Amino acid sequence: MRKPSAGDFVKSIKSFIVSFSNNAPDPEKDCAMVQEFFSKMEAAFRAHPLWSGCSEEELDSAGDGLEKYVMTKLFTRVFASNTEEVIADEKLFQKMSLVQQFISPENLDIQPTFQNESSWLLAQKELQKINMYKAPRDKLVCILNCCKVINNLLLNASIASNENAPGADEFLPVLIYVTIKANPPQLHSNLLYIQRYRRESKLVGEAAYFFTNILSAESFISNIDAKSISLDEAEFEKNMESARAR
Amino acid sequence: SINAKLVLLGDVGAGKSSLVLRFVAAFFSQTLAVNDATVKFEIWDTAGQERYHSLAPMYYRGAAAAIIVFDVTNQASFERAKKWVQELQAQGNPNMVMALAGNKSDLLDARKVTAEDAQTYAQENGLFFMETSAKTATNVKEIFYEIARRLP
Secondary structure (H helix, E strand, C coil), X not given: CCCCXXXXXXXXXXXXXXXXXXXXXXXXXXXXXXXXXXXXXXXXXXXXXXXXXXXXXXXXXXXXXXHHHHHHHCHHHHCXXXXXXXXXHHHHHHHHHHHCCCCCHHHHCCCHHHCCCCCCHHHHHHHCCHHHCCCHHHHHXXXXXXXXXXXXXXXXXXXXXCCCCCCHHHHHHHHHHHHHHHCXXXXXXHHHHHHHHCXXXXXXXXXXXXXXXXXXXXXXXXXXXXXXXXXXXXXXXXXXXXXXXX | CCEEXXXXXXXXXXXXXXXXXXXXXXXXXXXXXXXXXXXXXXXXXXXXXXXXXXXXXXXXXXXXEEEEEEECCCCHHHHHHHHHHHHHHHHCCXXXXXXXXXXXXXXXXXXXXXHHHHHHHHHHCCCEEEECCCCXXXXXXXXXXXXXXXXX
């Protein structure tokens, strides 16, 4: 990347970091600047004569590279940079710490014909790798790797028990179970970070979809009470005490 | 030409996912071309279980279209289909091409909902009805085009 004719881009990508970071935090204003900045550079990488000479992966391999480096340096400025968000991370974690100890497939409507041995342990560990990456792309992959893992074992169960391939009647509930069991810390923040800073043009199709899934997984898990997981208002609360005591 | 977002709505046992399988997972792309205009279809599956009803709007946010499936052999899902279109009529952007599909007609005498019952309600509310079937490939290829024809 550090070719003796790249200096133009560096002086720009460096100068945006300073200009940008030296702004007081605003989630709307900030990310509109970043998604705004990415275009400026998008055209730029492709226009730049010294780069003749490229396919389409190569145009993205560049954009990913810019999404990454830039977001790395700007991470602690964009990620959970306000208080109301940090609280939502705390609130969720508490909820998920407790409910994981006693939730079962039925609560969320997962039929036995789709129940898994491991509790889809492999899916859980993919989400749990989320804070091991700083690039919006990489973070997203953690999520998509969770989704795929889920589908394979789900698809398997359909073959195993002769049914059709699985739809949202199967995926959404298992995603939740698996999110609760997983407790991927700083979720609320995480899902927004990716939402605000994944090169907008890539947050689309197959990806946008399963992202809306996990976003609605957060929502649901946030709102959990007896009724949303189908339990007596007695059982549910008692379980909460137990879980609290453990 | 036109990227387009479609949403399936309806309960379990409406079999919307058994339905779209003939149209070739929870999500399906399909670039479809009609009358020199070309439409890419982004089709989005939803969880049909009541306990998720209020997640629905996170999915149909920015929907170009929606298909509402019900079960013809089990009456109560037709009513759930009513509440759906009712909810769409109100919460989606008013420029939305909706379609009603009555699935599982693949049973030659079990059907509990009449063709008029369905045709009349659909007519009344600005959409068409189709008698969908997954076992006999009926009205799957078909239903997407009529919607395509109708997109801004």
